[PDB]
Symmetry: C3
Subunit: 137 residues, 3 copies
């Protein structure tokens, strides 16, 4: 007996250094409905309703700005004013009503043409989302 | 066909500098049931049950302490020790069981009578909450 | 009528200084089904399904690494790079599918043998989780 379900939880373990593009998380904690696509780093709404989104990422670059995108524009914009060195750790959560076809993803902005020396890492960056409430009916 | 639903997600983009008062988030990501009131900055429970709350805010002041209030007292107290440059970015999440009429809001405390020069900003601070489980019945 | 429900939200206020062991949160914001055991500091899955987990903790030690465990292995590994003052404030969220018997808990690692002088504190660290989707049936 079918139930309107949609959720995904994905990570990176590190590498976030490319700006202006959708961050493509490939570590899958959960993506049963395959509504999230690691090839594009985008979540595709296949069920209209209220979704909850949450992310915790580590960005390796200077003056980092994080944007959570819905459809084609930034709906959430993070600019941690407490950025030290060339590493930024941003997080956020929000509820977004989505229609079928609506896309949601994360994107970073900043300078990485002058990054110091890397390190061990093994630090999980995550992007999660799930359908809270299915629309009308 | 009615369903016990209650959720809200609101932000500010910036303005939080006044302490001791409910932070009035006015940017509405979601507030369909209008259980959140931007005039008071408080969420009003209209359905008894278990609620999840989550916030990510940036506070412009020193020696900042953040409190999530339920009814009339702080249930969550955040005093990040990682403060420096008079810019505190506190976050938190918790599950609270609420009864009809219970109010929930965020409140900050600190010294804002010696803040340096501002900046571009454009940094979303958010307050989100949703009914997870409706009570008994 | 029975509803497959399972959620918990617990905190500490301060203490986390001992590494390698499951953090025992004892402040109960919610633990109605008693699925979280404050004695062992572990959540026990009593209902198979999709769970959302969220945590915001403050660790008092140096070179702090944080791990969210599922059953016996670390699922999430948080190694905040912007650490200082021997105080690490880590947070994370993720969705995990669990089977009955599966245990989930938080554990920290790091050097706490030589920490500086404490302070007021009163800083709520939290560990929360809830069943999102009950399994098949």
């Amino acid at each position: 007996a079918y139930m309107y379900r949609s959720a995904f939880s994905v990570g990176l373990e590190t590498r976030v250094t490319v700006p202006n593009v959708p961050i493509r998380f490939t570590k899958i904690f959960y993506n049963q409905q395959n509504h999230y696509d690691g090839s594009t780093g985008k979540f595709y709404c296949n069920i209209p309703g209220l979704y909850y989104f949450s992310y915790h990422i580590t960005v390796y670059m200077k003056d980092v700005k994080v944007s959570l995108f819905k459809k084609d524009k930034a709906v959430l914009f993070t600019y941690d004013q407490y950025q030290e060195k060339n590493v930024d750790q941003a997080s956020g959560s929000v509820l977004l009503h989505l229609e079928v076809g609506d896309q949601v993803w994360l994107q970073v902005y900043g300078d990485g043409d002058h990054n110091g020396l890397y390190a061990d890492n093994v630090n999980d960056s995550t992007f999660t989302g799930f359908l809270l409430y299915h629309d009308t009916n």
